[PDB]
């Protein structure tokens, strides 16, 4: 199994990013994806989830109305577009996939984590 991060650098308050995460050997029954990110010394906090199931969303409040998360089925890679960025948002992504059955936690696998980079 691999979650291989893509898209990350530096960019102005105000512009426009897109992440990446192709995910290999996780099965598709319900599986759900997302992104995280860490700012230094601060603590991994959660950023928005797709459930692939479906394609239903979900955002932090931080990130609703700025961020859309998207998945491309048939290439298994999903996506984040972040666009009117702010410095806040500078941090480590990390990418994540899991699977939840009976409460049990099935599986869940991260990515190594992509820097992003907003300067003022």
């Known amino acids: 199994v691999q979650l291989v991060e893509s898209g990350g650098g530096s960019v102005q308050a105000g512009g426009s990013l897109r992440l990446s995460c192709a995910a290999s050997?996780?099965?598709?029954?319900?599986?759900?994806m997302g992104w995280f990110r860490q700012a230094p010394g601060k603590q991994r906090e959660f950023v928005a989830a797709?459930?692939?199931?479906?394609?239903?969303?979900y955002y932090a409040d931080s990130v609703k109305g700025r961020f859309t998360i998207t998945r491309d089925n048939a290439k298994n890679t999903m996506y984040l577009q972040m666009d009117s960025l702010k410095p806040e948002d500078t941090a480590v992504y990390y990418c994540?996939?899991?699977?939840?059955?009976?409460?049990?936690?099935?599986?869940?696998?991260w990515g190594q984590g992509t820097q992003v980079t907003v300067s003022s």
């Open positions: 050997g996780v099965p598709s029954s319900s599986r759900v």
């Open positions: 797709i459930s692939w199931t479906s394609g239903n969303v």
């Open positions: 994540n996939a899991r699977r939840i059955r009976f409460g049990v936690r099935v599986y869940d696998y």
